[PDB]
Write a protein that binds this ligand. Structure first.
Ligand SMILES: NC(=O)OC[C@@H](O)C[C@H](NC(=O)[C@H]1NCCC[C@H]1O)C(=O)N[C@@H](Cc1c[nH]cn1)C(=O)N[C@H](C(=O)O)[C@H](O)c1c[nH]c(Cl)n1
Ligand SMILES: [K+]
Ligand SMILES: [K+]
Ligand SMILES: [K+]
Ligand SMILES: [K+]
Ligand SMILES: [K+]
Ligand SMILES: [Mg+2]
Ligand SMILES: [Mg+2]
Ligand SMILES: [Mg+2]
Ligand SMILES: [Mg+2]
Ligand SMILES: [Mg+2]
Ligand SMILES: [Mg+2]
Ligand SMILES: [Mg+2]
Ligand SMILES: [Mg+2]
Ligand SMILES: [Mg+2]
Ligand SMILES: [Mg+2]
Ligand SMILES: [Mg+2]
Ligand SMILES: [Mg+2]
Lengths: 101, 117, 102, 64
RNA sequence: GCGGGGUGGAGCAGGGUAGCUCGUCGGGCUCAUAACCCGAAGGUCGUCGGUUCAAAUCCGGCCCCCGC
RNA sequence: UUGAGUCUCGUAGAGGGGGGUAGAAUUCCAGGUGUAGCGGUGAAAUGCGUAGAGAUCUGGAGGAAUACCGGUGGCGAAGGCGGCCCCCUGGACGAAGACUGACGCUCAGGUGCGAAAGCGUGGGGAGCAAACAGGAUUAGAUACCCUGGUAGUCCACGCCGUAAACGAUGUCGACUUGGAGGUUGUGCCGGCGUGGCUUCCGGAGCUAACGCGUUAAGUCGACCGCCUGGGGAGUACGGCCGCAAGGUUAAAACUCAAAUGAAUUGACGGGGGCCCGCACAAGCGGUGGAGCAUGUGGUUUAAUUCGAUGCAACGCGAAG
RNA sequence: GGUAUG
């Protein structure tokens, strides 16, 4: 003004991602959607779940110059926004399909 | 057509518009291009970028004459003074002498009245 | 193309704009005549005139004062004008007679 | 402001020299003052206020 | 007599594919008002059909209506 | 002979009048090259351009003004005066003397000079530009803005006689602490003096205060001009002056109880400077659309009890 | 950044 690691992969970037996906404090609901999405992603790509997630972020990450914290924050926000718009049936698959694309 | 080794880039940089004209050394017109003719209209013309584009299209007009040397002759207080010559050098002409024309009366005629705005 | 010129000559066809003189329930003869003059001009120079009367606060309770002003304009601008529209109700606080060149 | 690019000089360095040649010579300031007519009383008034400012800054530099 | 046109209340755009202006109403903005901004309601488009895949559209009749 | 003049020698200066001339720039004309824009604004349009513009280059024509130097620099009674050169010409200042011997100061009336606009006659006319024409803007736009554009601006001669013609400060003389500069002489040995003009600050003193302050608005003397509440009014009438526009001299009735100056405290400013608050920005979730709850306005009613109304009334007094 | 009016 005028004046925590995600517990399944050790990436805080995914802990942030859970938080952006989360609605109404429902953090466990959010966690399941994202993990389900990452395993789905891995089965239809074939990496460790972060590499595919990070390649998916690289395509969205915007370059006034965006600095790298806002960059990944924007990317993840745009991914989640893009995912929620779609007509795939669950958010897990919406997220998996959006990440794939 | 004729080939010309060395040319002259006359940059009429007014406040509202930029005219870039490549001539021979004797001031015979080879090609010209303006910010107004570069898909900028109104006060879009009076930016450095619109002059930059006008320079590039002027360079493209005089590709056939096979010019590599240009002497620059910038004239006026226009926003696109330096952006033209920068973009002319980017086209790949070796800029020799860089020179400010700009007609100054030594007194001369009475100017129009000040705009009350 | 200088084609354009065709339009410039085309554009020497013409155009009517409507010009809006706002009267108030109690404007005085002097200013009436000034605004009346403005309209004569407007009209004679080939233009329409959205004449508006604009009741303010309680004045809305004597709308009939207003209507008399309009009716005076109609009756003065008689040989110059025909009265596209007259009002009867007082929507908002306004009465918006539109006159046109006879 | 005539700037021949000397034996083996970059453009960016050469452009800095040209812009500086114009800045010293007084071309953009000169064109702008000659854009609209200033009548002598305005000219003289402007020249007085500058002289007052210049001098008053020296008396602010002094007494300090 | 000869034509034009009949299009939301207003008037004016618009071979099929109806707006635009101002009313008209409500909202927003403001301390308040005008200005400004947004939304909605208003036509079936003179009528009668034929005719065109299309009827504001095309073609005629008719109602016209004023200009003349 | 100390005031006031004259002479000798030298100095600085946009002082004045006349003539000539230089370079830059705008416009225009004629060509060459060239090709679709140019110009303009807050945004546009009018306008200009394929009968070739704008741009660029060569040449020509014409008028007006003199960049830099340039300076709270200079000169002039004031108005004003700015390229360079010559001719004619006015004033100021310094150094030493020599000379005249109060020849002085001020000045009603008078006489002349007197920015710009304006007027008459005849020229001239690039640029600029009242009026005007068109294009915009707007509630309107007789404007501000845009494109054009006539008088005029320029010259000669004559007229006008006014300006915030201001230092809003009459002219002349004498006297009265200082400081820092500028400009222009001059003596003496960069320094040390000494004259003229001039800028800024400030002491006593003065002043309502602001301020002025050896260039006084201080302390005095000479002479002139002028003021006597505001508006009416620098108007009417009369005279004088002018071709005219108008100028100059200059009231009264009446009406008002004020008008006014400087400064103080606020407040305010589409004045400047520095800060803060979920004020904005960055976010996340809403309201505004739907249904319903609730309050209010309105309307209705026999009554729809009274109160709360921008922020700071409206699930508020009412916790039923 | 500039619109007026109580
Ligand atoms: N017309 C009416 O009755 O009302 C409208 C008027 O109030 C508009 C208002 N106008 C202005 O301030 C004038 N200032 C002087 C130059 C002209 C004009 O600009 C205005 O808002 N301007 C805008 C431009 C504009 C005009 N119409 C719509 N918009 C503007 O930018 N004004 C500037 C400002 O307010 O600082 C400035 O005055 C300006 C720049 N350029 C121009 Cl033109 N004007
Ligand atoms: K006498
Ligand atoms: K003229
Ligand atoms: K005091
Ligand atoms: K008289
Ligand atoms: K009296
Ligand atoms: Mg002088
Ligand atoms: Mg003067
Ligand atoms: Mg005297
Ligand atoms: Mg004159
Ligand atoms: Mg004359
Ligand atoms: Mg002009
Ligand atoms: Mg003009
Ligand atoms: Mg006087
Ligand atoms: Mg006086
Ligand atoms: Mg002082
Ligand atoms: Mg006094
Ligand atoms: Mg008089």
């Amino acid at each position: 003004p005028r004046r925590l690691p995600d517990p399944k992969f050790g990436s805080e970037l995914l802990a942030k991602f859970v938080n952006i996906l989360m609605v109404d404090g429902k953090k466990s609901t959010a966690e399941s959607i994202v993990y389900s999405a990452l395993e789905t992603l891995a089965q239809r790509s074939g990496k460790s779940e972060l590499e595919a997630f990070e390649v998916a972020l690289e395509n969205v990450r915007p370059t006034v110059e965006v600095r790298p914290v806002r960059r990944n924050a924007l990317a993840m926000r745009w991914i989640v926004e893009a995912a929620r718009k779609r007509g795939d049936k669950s958010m897990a698959l919406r997220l998996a399909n959006e990440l794939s694309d | 057509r004729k080939q010309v080794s060395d040319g002259v880039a006359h940059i009429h940089a007014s406040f509202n518009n930029t005219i870039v004209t490549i001539t021979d050394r004797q001031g015979n017109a080879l090609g010209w291009a303006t910010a107004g003719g570069s898909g900028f209209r109104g006060s879009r013309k009076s930016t450095p970028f619109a002059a930059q584009v006008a320079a590039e299209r002027c360079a493209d007009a005089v590709k056939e004459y096979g010019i590599k040397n240009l002497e620059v002759m910038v004239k006026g207080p226009g926003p696109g003074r330096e952006s033209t010559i920068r973009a002319l050098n980017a086209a790949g002409f070796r800029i020799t002498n860089i020179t400010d024309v700009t007609p100054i009366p030594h007194x001369g005629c009475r100017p129009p009245k000040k705009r009350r705005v | 193309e200088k084609s354009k010129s065709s339009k410039e000559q085309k554009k020497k066809q013409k155009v009517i704009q409507v010009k809006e003189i706002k009267f108030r329930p109690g404007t005085d003869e002097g200013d009436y005549q000034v605004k009346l003059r403005s309209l004569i001009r407007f009209l004679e120079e080939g233009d329409k005139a959205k004449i508006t009367l604009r009741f303010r606060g309680r004045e809305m309770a004597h709308q009939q004062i207003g209507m008399e002003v309009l009716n005076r304009v109609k009756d003065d601008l008689q040989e110059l004008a025909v009265v596209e529209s007259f009002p009867t109700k007082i929507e908002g606080r306004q009465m918006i007679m539109v006159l046109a060149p006879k | 402001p005539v700037i021949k690019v000397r034996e083996n000089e970059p453009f960016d360095v050469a452009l800095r020299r040209f812009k500086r040649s114009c800045e010293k010579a007084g071309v953009l300031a000169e064109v702008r003052r000659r854009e609209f007519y200033e009548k002598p009383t305005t000219e003289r008034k402007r020249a007085k206020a500058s002289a007052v400012k210049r001098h008053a800054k020296k008396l602010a530099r002094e007494n300090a």
